[PDB]
Amino acid sequence: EVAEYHYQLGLTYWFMGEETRKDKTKALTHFLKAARLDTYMGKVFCYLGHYYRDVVGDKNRARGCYRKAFELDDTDAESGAAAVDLSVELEDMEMALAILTTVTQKASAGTAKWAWLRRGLYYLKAGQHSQAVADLQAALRADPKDFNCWESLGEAYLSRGGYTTALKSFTKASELNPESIYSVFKVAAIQQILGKYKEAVAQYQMIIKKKEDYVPALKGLGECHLMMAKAALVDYLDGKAVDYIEKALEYFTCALQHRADVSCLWKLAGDACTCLYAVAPSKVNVHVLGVLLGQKEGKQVLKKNELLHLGGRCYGRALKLMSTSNTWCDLGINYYRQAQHLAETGSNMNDLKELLEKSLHCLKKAVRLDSNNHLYWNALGVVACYSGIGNYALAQHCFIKSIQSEQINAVAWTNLGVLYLTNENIEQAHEAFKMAQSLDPSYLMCWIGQALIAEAVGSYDTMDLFRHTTELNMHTEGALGYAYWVCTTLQDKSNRETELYQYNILQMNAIPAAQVILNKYVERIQNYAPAFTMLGYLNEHLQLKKEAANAYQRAILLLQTAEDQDTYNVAIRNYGRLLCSTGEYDKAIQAFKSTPLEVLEDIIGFALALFMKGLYKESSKAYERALSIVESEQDKAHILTALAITEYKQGKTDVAKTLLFKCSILKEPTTESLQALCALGLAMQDATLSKAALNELLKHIKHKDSNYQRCLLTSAIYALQGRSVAVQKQISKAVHSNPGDPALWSLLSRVVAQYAQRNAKGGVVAGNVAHILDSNHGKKALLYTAVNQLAMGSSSAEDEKNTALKTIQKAALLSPGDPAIWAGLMAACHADDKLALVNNTQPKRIDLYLALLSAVSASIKDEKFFENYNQSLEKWSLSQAVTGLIDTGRISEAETLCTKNLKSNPDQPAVILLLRQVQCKPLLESQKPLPDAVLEELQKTVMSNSTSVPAWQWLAHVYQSQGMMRAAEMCYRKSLQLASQRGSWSGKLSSLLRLALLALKVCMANISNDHWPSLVQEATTEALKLCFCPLAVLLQALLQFKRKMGARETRRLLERVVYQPGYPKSIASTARWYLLRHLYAKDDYELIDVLVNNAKTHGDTRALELNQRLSSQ
């Protein structure tokens, strides 16, 4: 009768095995007798519970037993848990909750994990998210850190709305046990919810990597791609939308492979299929793979109608699996879209009635299922008012019902306003649109309706309303309206100063916005020929001729199957004009052939294209036909001018002259005819007809607003007569008259660079001012001032950052397209080398001549025609490159260049002279006698290309270097005579100075036959008469010192040269040297000290060196 012994024997039989548990006579009998002998041994009732639970199955009594066990021992979590679990299995939730509450009320601090989990899971199953949240925090603070609680907390936090601590809980669950995927999926779901679809897509791809069959990830990817496609469709990007739709459909069918019973996937597939409506037919071709198209066969390509049919099928399947009003309305909308597509293309009519009936039935069923949704009512109304049905009473009823269902309904209000507006109800349509605008300030359709009403009433702010509408959300109607209004406003030519054209078309920059608007519109619709012509016209205004030609071509293709009287012929003519403007003369001729040549415009365009291609006779014939047709006399005068131009192009200048005279005799001359006559007179050497035409232009023509052209014509008039000085005077007068107009300053700089290049400082100043005055003239201005600085030499304050090299580099940076800049760069590099040699510090910028020559040739090759100027440019560039290579010491490269040039074409004297110099650089560098045969060859080659001073000076130098004083003197005299005859001035001075130097050298050799001093004196006197040459006065001083030596006068002359300011450093140094010499001969120590300190105030070393050297005799 010991309860404990009976208990332990019962346990023994329980643990012996399943067979002893199944024998009812041992386990049960001992547990029941023990429980009868001692009723407080709760564990015995617990074990009776286990026996009856697992062997007998009487759950209700078992629950009661576990309850008594827990009442006897409230620490037995096992009995309590089993009682709760059986109560939940018995649907007795009140007892389970009472137990759980008693436990958690006694659990002051944790130690109730099982009960917290029970209550939290139960409340999560129910709609009690707040209580579930509370229980989850308590369970989490219980002590266990397992994920299964963190994930529950995160899910409840997401359910209530919080997005921060949910992410924290999901992150914690992932970090403590990564094997779970649900937490990462929920993180990606949160990322998707708050926009930023791309990050969610990346997370979903990463999740799908590890496991390829997770349905939620495929659904998320499909939804993200659908939303991105819709966002792309908000703008006008049809290709992006189509690609996103295809990807979303692929993901949706991939998910449907695994779970085919889910209405969500079917409805999402239907939505994706039907989303691509009213998007550029013949641009939608979608790849759908596998099971969707009947039998599983690879991948197939579907069109718009097939895609819509597939969407309808998917909607039907989703409806079959789940009947909901939302899917009914979606099916109705899908059928409505299908009917719209069938009607739009004109494929059929009156055979779409079945689709409309199906859509109406589905929408009516949906709206009757729940008559409290503004969406269903509005959809029913919109579908009812379709042109194929036209049930306006039902549409009005549905719109009123949708308005009544929810007060803030801008869509229904604007639909009602549109219905009233199209049925001639301006006032009430305005009222409804105003109501919609007040209820929603950022709705586009109401604004478009207001703009349409304003246009229908003829207001003044219709253009501004359309512009604001286009700026807001890029809708098609506002786009077309704004484009049409801008084109019409531009077309009228009497508005130029009415302050409406000015403000409308200049401060708002209407043309580029209209161009972009029309591009988007033509992308969306692409079946409107007027839109194509408007786009072409706008592109013409923007100098976008290729786009204009393409638009005209597409308009032509669209318009071929039309009435063809005005639209198609004008399209052909515009396409031909644009095509001719961008080369393609044969295509322009063909385009102008395919039209009736009975209108002035077509005939004149044909004539211009013919002239551009050639065929001057046919051009003249067409111009004569236009002249026969012409009216609007200004046009007749222009036709006469064109006829004169083409006649001149055929030679035969007399008939062109008579045509221009005929144009002049007309009642009122035109500026173009007079300018053409003056230029034609300039082309010939008459120069008197040009003066008369210029007088005519000056007399009674002032409305012309181009001072540059008139100044250029006058300058050319003056330059033709060979004066060459009055050009600068005329341009200076023009600049004085108009201090602005940077073109005049640039012209002045260029003209002083070319003619009369002695005002080099003025030219540099004019170029700098022209560059300052504006920005787009900087290129030419900098080129001209660089050349003027090159002409000056080094007549500055030796300041950096302002030399010809810097300015030419700036010009090269501004526009690296012309060859003259590269040639000037070569010249500047050579001049800098010479300057560095003079200063004797370092040679720099040694070897770039080949690259610059190649650049010059490449940039020359791409100009239309400047033949003589191009030839001179290429000759100068080649000669300068050869000379620079010779100077630097790359004789082999120079010889290869010369040989290639002479192999390319038969010989020309300049290149043979260059080759002679190349060959003769090595020989005679070191002292060596040369055969008289070589001397005769050199003399013959110099004779080959005469009338060039450089070659004569070089041959004189060669003669002197070998030694021929008479021959060198003769050559210098010949060069002097040639330079004086040819009108040059620098060459005359150079010849004088070179002859003086040679004769002074020969006199310094103390030779007899004292005629060389006479030559020195005459040359120096002539040079001094020419200009103020410090070198000439110094040569005079050297000769005078050599003769007398002792004579006091010589010291006076030397002191004048060394003491008068404005002299170069080297000449002053030489004069100082000889003055010190003369005074040391004259033995005056005070003057020697004066010389020493004078040398010390300036910078010198040689004078002080010789002073010290002769001080210590």
Partner: peptide, 14 residues
């Protein structure tokens, strides 16, 4: 100092 009218007249005559 020949003006336009004289030039036209002279050329027309010849």
């Amino acid at each position: 100092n020949l003006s336009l009218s004289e030039l036209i007249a002279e050329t027309i005559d010849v």
